[PDB]
């Protein structure tokens, strides 16, 4: 049960992320080259 | 009138407990259904957008 | 062993995953008074 | 006064762009993360710095 928690919870974050990315590149180009950085940071 | 640095401080301290409110509701929340988190998160997402 | 060592691994996650969320609660209840 | 604007609106966006990156931190390696997040609270600390000038 916790491993099904963590796992469920990693890809949870995982699509939080991805989300938080694509929208900040979308609203906010100038700001998306550090994000896939940040993406490479985290990655 | 209301006074636009009232104005100013109430927004920030608005946008402080969004901020604090979403990670709560992460904190809590990872592991209920994927497709419903992922439309509340995006509900939140879009929050945080219109409050900057 | 085997078992064993698998067994307490994934209750040394377990735990450091529940520490870090009491950790994270403790920081926000701290830091809601600077906001 | 026009600088002190255009580095609030800087600071803002690298308060946002930090806290998309702690969040991945949480997301990933948490076990660091506070290694970030006094961080950004410094930048937030910096924005009342800021708020000083103004007043």
């Keep these: ?43 | 009138m209301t006074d636009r640095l009232t104005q100013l401080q109430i927004c920030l301290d608005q946008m402080t407990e969004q901020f604090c409110a979403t990670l709560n509701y992460i904190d809590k929340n990872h592991g209920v259904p994927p497709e419903e988190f992922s439309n509340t998160i995006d509900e939140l997402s879009t929050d945080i957008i219109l409050k900057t | 062993h085997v078992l064993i060592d698998l067994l307490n691994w994934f209750r040394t996650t377990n735990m450091n995953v529940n520490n870090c969320i009491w950790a994270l609660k403790s920081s926000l209840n701290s830091m809601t008074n600077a906001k | 006064y026009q600088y002190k604007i255009q580095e609030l609106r800087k600071l803002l966006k690298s308060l946002l762009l930090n806290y998309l990156e702690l969040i991945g931190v949480l997301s990933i390696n948490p076990d660091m993360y506070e290694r970030k997040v006094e961080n950004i609270r410094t930048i937030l600390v910096n924005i009342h710095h800021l708020l000083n000038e103004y007043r």
Aim: net charge positive; glycine share 4%.
């Design chain 1, 1 to 43: 049960r916790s491993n099904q928690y963590q796992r469920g919870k990693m890809h949870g974050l995982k699509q939080l992320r991805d989300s938080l990315a694509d929208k900040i590149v979308d609203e906010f180009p100038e700001l998306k080259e550090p994000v896939e950085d940040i993406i490479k940071r985290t990655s």
